[PDB]
């Protein structure tokens, strides 16, 4: 359960979505992003 909502989602923060968007507890990872929308971990999940 990450450290951001759409509103609080700053730049260079990881845009990896956690949970269902219809859920009240929906969040984004929000850790430091590196070369893209995602931290290394979630970039790995997201690509290839």
């Amino acid at each position: 359960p990450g450290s951001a909502t759409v509103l609080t989602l700053g730049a260079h923060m990881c845009k990896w979505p956690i949970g269902d968007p219809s859920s009240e507890g929906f969040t984004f990872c929000g850790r430091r992003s590196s070369e893209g929308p995602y931290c290394v971990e979630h970039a790995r999940v997201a690509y290839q």
Partner: protein, 324 residues
Amino acid sequence: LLSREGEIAIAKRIEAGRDTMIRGLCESALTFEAIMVWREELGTGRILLREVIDLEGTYAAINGVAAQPAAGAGPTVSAMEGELREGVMAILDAIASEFEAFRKLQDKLVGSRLKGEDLSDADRKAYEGLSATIIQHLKTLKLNNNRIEALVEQLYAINKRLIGLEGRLLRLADSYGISRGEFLKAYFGSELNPTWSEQVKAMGVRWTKFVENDSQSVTDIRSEIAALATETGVPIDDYRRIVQTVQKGEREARQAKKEMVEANLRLVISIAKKYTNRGLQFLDLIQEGNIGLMKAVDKFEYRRGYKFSTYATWWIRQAITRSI
């Protein structure tokens, strides 16, 4: 380039951005006036079901399958509309009622601010509840992308008029030697305050000269501004926040979509190669294919488990063929 999880992540970001947009939009009276007009024009055949909702998305949601272009045994546009109309009208109906309820508290809040005080704690909690349930409901309506974009345009237009009026007040204040910071701190949050001009007088001779000598311009502009607050059913500072909310959601959705399109360029190309000599240049084929891709992205429902690329192929192909 994308894994299935990357596709899902993108879908989720788009959906979240969209939700943030709707969340901001539902605070404004104009968005629901618009939806009431659309209900009207549907009821009288002025407009077609396909212009208000995502037709193929909604129809696909009936059996929980992938959205596909409308029609050799598949359903035509008219077929889909015939299947979906009653349910869409029922939802618009229910939503109309929830909007009326919500708008009563909107008028209560704006009037309250106009008298200087605020909504009662109960009326306020009721406001919150109504907002939430309305946002959820509207989500079940599956509005057309063009309709949402139209709402966004209307919202932003209002905002441009507001920024104009505030610009005027700003230079006005400047001429009496009141800096931007001084003014904005005295002005932000009190745009609906009836006794503003009298209250700022207490800030000294510059302010007194400002709102007495130029009382005409000042009261005029503040009247116009207040009229915006009336035209949208929210106080001005709330409108400021709504606009930022919608902009933020919009940018997230736009970026996620862009990522998805870029990540499916190869697919687009591989489909364009199959239509080389049919009248159009390769780049034209690509751009059209991309229009189709973007449509596949708009209608994509990740929860239903169907593979994105093979689904997208139909929409890409349709865009290419149509252009031909």
